[PDB]
């Protein structure tokens, strides 16, 4: 048992038993592992676009093909071993040695690494991919060479890495089937050097069966920092004194593009024309209005986050020319012409060869808002004669399905999160290497194939972010393919659900004090949620 006034209870991102703390497997690692235990070279702030120096004291392009990091002086692993340039070197090079490591692809465009001293890392690139490099700067955890040095590729990839040895503000304390506990590392270098200190001695990641459970926890003050979707926000504020980012609708920040991935390898979902018909049959308005009660924004056919820097590169003409809209009569007309007609009289269209068509549509059990949205979609598909069958597997199975591509229709917001570049969005959708992967963690979960996109993705990647004209043109070419072939159908912008209660901790950020992004998802703590810990104050 932990002293309540020195413990902060977080929930919203833990939907399976804690069973993995491996920095090399970010898809399985318990939320907080990267961020609270492992650190990155930079923080990234979605509120501003700022890269704030963490392990790195500075980072600079020296010329077009050479990037230099200079580490802060006085960084230490938790076992008092100095964290140096060779740890950063190792973090990259281990992935050239063991190609199974998820970022081994970096060595296709990174040539080599130099370390002139204990603080300096120089990356020389053969093909500098600026967009993806910017993202690595705040997402790639730095790992201890002295710990991983002697491990083979199988250990690295399969180890659960209990009690991770990192450099961050917390260590793993304890866990069970329904919670992860972190304990603050008092001798953290970060406090000595940066002068910041996380206020809670204990951070507990709470696992819960369903969003509905979270509400009770919040009302009784058993949850402090909630990323769970919950309905009736005005009533939550007025009656139960629960707070959100904005005083007024939409109440929450937007964090993701929520849409449907389709199995592009399964007939008839393999037909671009059929996929278009699905897209034209779905009206997100009732989802936005009724499921979320206006706490989210509807997406246009391209699906660029309106609050993101992707809008800097918005291919306006392309969307107006090639985008789809809700148009069920035209959806029926398309299906007719393709020969998808009802021959047995059950209201559902069969294949041109008279074969029945039934498509599973899925999201995790307990994600109440997506379960409702899915039935809205089922009901909408019903009236154009498409038989969609709702399926709500455990989260663990939902993700296994996603990674293996074992689904028909899948509601998805994995990898479509706000970022420093629209490249992350197009990469998540088109991820060409999914086609050669049993497990695709990165994207293109339905295994869509296209001979142009890989070249287009690379060309975008290697274009300096300040060449607005060229980045925009490439977003247009990529967007054009997206809108024409619809491997992913954008539907709305996911709410960054963030609800707090002040009986134990105060000084949360909100629209009047907008100092940090409030996201406790795995691999997002370095975008603001850790910073929130630096700023929390005990309640009086
Ligand atoms: O809104 C659906 C559920 O989202 C959950 O947060 C997700 C987020 O949508 C996204 O999928 C990201 O990759 O993982 C997050 C953490 O699991 C929860 O907010 C849940 O309460 C919502 O029902
Ligand atoms: Mg029929």
Overall 3D geometry?
globular
Which ligands accompany this protein?
a molecule of 2 linked components (BMA-BMA), magnesium ion
Briefly note the CATH topology name of the largest domain.
Dipeptide-binding Protein, domain 3
Spatial order of strands in the largest sheet: 8-9-10-1-11-18
Description:
The strands form 5 sheets. This protein has a 6-stranded mixed sheet. Strands 13-17-12-16-14-15 form a 6-stranded mixed sheet, covered by helices on one side. Strands 4-5-7-6 form a 4-stranded antiparallel sheet, with helices on one face. The chain is built from 18 helices and 20 strands. It is α+β, with helices and mostly antiparallel strands and about 550 residues long. It is globular. A molecule of 2 linked components (BMA-BMA) binds near residues 12, 13, 368, 370 and 521.
């Amino acid at each position: 048992v932990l002293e309540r006034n020195e413990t902060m209870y977080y929930g919203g991102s833990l939907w399976s038993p804690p069973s993995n703390w491996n920095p090399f497997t970010p898809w399985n690692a318990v939320p907080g592992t990267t961020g609270l235990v492992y650190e990155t070279m930079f923080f990234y702030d979605p509120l501003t676009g700022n890269f704030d120096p963490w392990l790195a004291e500075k980072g600079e392009w020296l010329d077009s093909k050479t990037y230099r990091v200079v580490l802060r002086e006085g960084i230490y692993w938790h076992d008092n071993v100095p964290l140096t340039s060779e740890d950063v070197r190792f973090t990259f090079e281990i992935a050239k040695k063991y190609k199974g490591i998820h970022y081994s692809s970096v060595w296709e465009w990174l040539d080599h690494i130099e370390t002139p001293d204990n603080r300096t890392v120089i990356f020389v690139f053969k093909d500098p991919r600026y967009h993806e490099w910017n993202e690595l700067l705040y997402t790639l955890p730095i790992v201890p060479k002295h710990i991983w040095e002697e491990k083979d590729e199988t250990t690295i990839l399969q180890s659960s890495n209990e009690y991770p040895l990192g450099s961050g503000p917390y260590v793993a304390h304890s866990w069970d089937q329904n919670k992860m506990i972190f304990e603050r590392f008092e001798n953290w270098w970060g406090t000595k050097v940066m002068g910041v200190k996380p206020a809670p001695k204990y951070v507990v990641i709470v696992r819960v069966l369903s969003n509905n459970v979270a509400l009770g926890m919040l009302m009784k003050g058993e949850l402090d920092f909630s990323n769970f979707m919950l309905p009736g926000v005005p009533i939550l504020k007025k009656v139960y004194n629960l707070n959100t980012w904005y005083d007024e609708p939409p109440y929450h920040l937007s964090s993701t593009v929520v849409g449907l991935f389709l199995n592009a390898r399964k007939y008839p979902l393999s037909l671009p024309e059929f996929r278009r018909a699905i897209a034209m049959s779905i009206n997100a308005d009732p989802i936005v209005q009724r499921v979320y009660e206006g706490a989210v924004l509807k997406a246009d056919p391209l699906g660029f986050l309106p609050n993101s820097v992707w809008m800097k590169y918005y291919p306006k003409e392309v969307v107006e020319k090639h985008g789809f809209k809700y148009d069920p009569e035209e959806a029926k007309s398309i299906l007719d012409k393709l020969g998808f007609r009802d021959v047995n009289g059950d209201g559902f269209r069969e294949t041109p060869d008279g074969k029945p068509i039934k498509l599973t549509i899925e999201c995790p059990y307990g994600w109440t808002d997506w379960m409702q949205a899915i039935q809205v979609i089922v009901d909408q598909l019903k009236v154009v004669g498409i038989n969609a069958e709702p399926y709500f597997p455990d989260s663990s199975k939902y993700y296994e399905n996603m990674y293996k591509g074992e689904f028909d229709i899948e509601m998805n917001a994995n990898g479509t999160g706000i970022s420093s570049t629209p490249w992350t969005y197009f990469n998540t959708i088109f991820y060409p290497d999914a086609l050669e992967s049993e497990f695709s963690y990165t994207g293109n979960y339905g295994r869509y194939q296209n001979p142009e996109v890989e070249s287009l993705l690379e060309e975008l990647n290697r274009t300096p972010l300040d060449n607005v004209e060229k980045v925009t043109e490439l977003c247009g070419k990529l967007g054009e393919i997206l809108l024409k072939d619809l491997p992913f159908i954008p539907l709305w912008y996911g709410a960054m659900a963030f609800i707090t209660q002040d009986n134990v901790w105060t000084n949360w950020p909100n629209e009047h004090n907008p100092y940090a992004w409030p996201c406790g998802w795995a691999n997002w703590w370095q975008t603001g949620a850790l910073k929130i810990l630096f700023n929390l104050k005990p309640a009086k």
